[PDB]
Design a protein around this ligand. Structure first.
Ligand SMILES: [Mn+2]
Ligand SMILES: [Mn+2]
Length: 301
């Protein structure tokens, strides 16, 4: 297995999520990352630098960085046969990472399992819009600006890739969105399983997920820890109430990993920010580490 750890090229020590990533990397290294009973699960720990997207503030810089640094590095990772566990730090990085994923699997239909309290389709003022860029639904805007966005949303695809089928993006636990995001979801008919549907019948949720993904060749799982209830888990930047319990997430994760074991080619876990926790113990870190053990132990086979 390959462990990818994202870190901001600039000002990483000021970022609570980057600190989360370094904590998890060191923790992993000791365990999964070391020889346990004659076996080393994580054979490589790779650090990947990223640049924060500040929209108008640094559009060009971000564009160039992604095209020249982030995407090329992630493609190198996705080109290896070994299963990759990606610590993204911040969900916004999912864009560059996923474009690299699409680039490597250019002739494959890709499905997305997105566990998050947010839809991440449109920037709200809080959370980015990686999916809005993956889906090409970024939207006042000049023709030059739309040209710039088309340029960006297209990175890493101009030797081609398929466009993502909005119906193959499956949302889990989404509960905090903008009407503009809800309009895209309704219009594109993107399957969305709420906290209640998951809690009421996880089995049906998974079965309906299979139906939506029956035609895809490979799957990408992106997990945002804020899918867990904001009161129960506080080590995340944007906490949302009415979320899943720690055990519910573990149950949903186990089923999804087992149900899609064959086509799952990558797992991304993001938004772990220990600096904003309101608790004074090891509880939350232990929970994240347990989430990681569960993912690693299921996918290493
Ligand atoms: Mn997110
Ligand atoms: Mn989120």
């Amino acid at each position: 297995m390959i462990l990818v750890g994202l870190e901001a090229e600039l000002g990483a020590s000021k970022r609570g999520t980057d600190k989360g990533v370094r904590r998890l990397r060191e923790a992993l290294s000791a365990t999964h990352g070391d020889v346990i009973k004659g076996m080393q699960t994580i054979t490589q720990e790779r650090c990947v630098l990223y640049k924060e997207f500040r929209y108008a503030k640094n559009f060009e810089d971000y564009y160039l960085f992604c095209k020249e640094n982030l995407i090329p590095c992630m493609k190198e990772v996705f080109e290896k046969k070994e299963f990759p566990l990606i610590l993204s730090s911040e969900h916004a990085n999912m864009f560059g990472i996923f474009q690299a994923f699409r680039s490597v699997h250019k002739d494959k239909k890709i499905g997305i399992l997105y566990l998050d309290a947010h839809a991440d389709i449109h920037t709200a003022y809080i959370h980015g819009m990686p999916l809005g860029m993956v889906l090409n639904r970024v939207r006042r805007m000049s023709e030059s600006e739309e040209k710039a966005w088309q340029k960006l949303c297209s990175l890493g695809l101009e030797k081609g890739g398929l466009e993502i089928d909005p119906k193959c993006l499956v949302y889990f636990g989404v509960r905090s969105t903008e009407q503009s995001e809800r309009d895209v979801i309704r219009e594109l008919q993107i399957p969305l399983f709420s906290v209640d549907a998951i809690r009421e019948n996880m089995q049906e949720v998974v079965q309906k997920t299979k139906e939506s993904l029956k035609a895809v060749d490979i799957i990408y799982l992106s997990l945002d820890l804020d899918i867990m209830d904001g009161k129960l888990f506080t080590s995340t930047g944007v906490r949302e109430n009415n979320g899943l319990s720690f055990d519910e997430l573990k149950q949903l994760l186990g089923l999804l990993l087992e149900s899609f074991k064959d086509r799952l080619k990558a797992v991304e876990v993001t938004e772990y920010n220990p600096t904003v926790s309101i608790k004074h113990n090891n509880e939350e870190e232990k929970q994240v580490l347990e989430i990681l053990d569960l993912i690693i132990n299921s996918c290493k086979i």
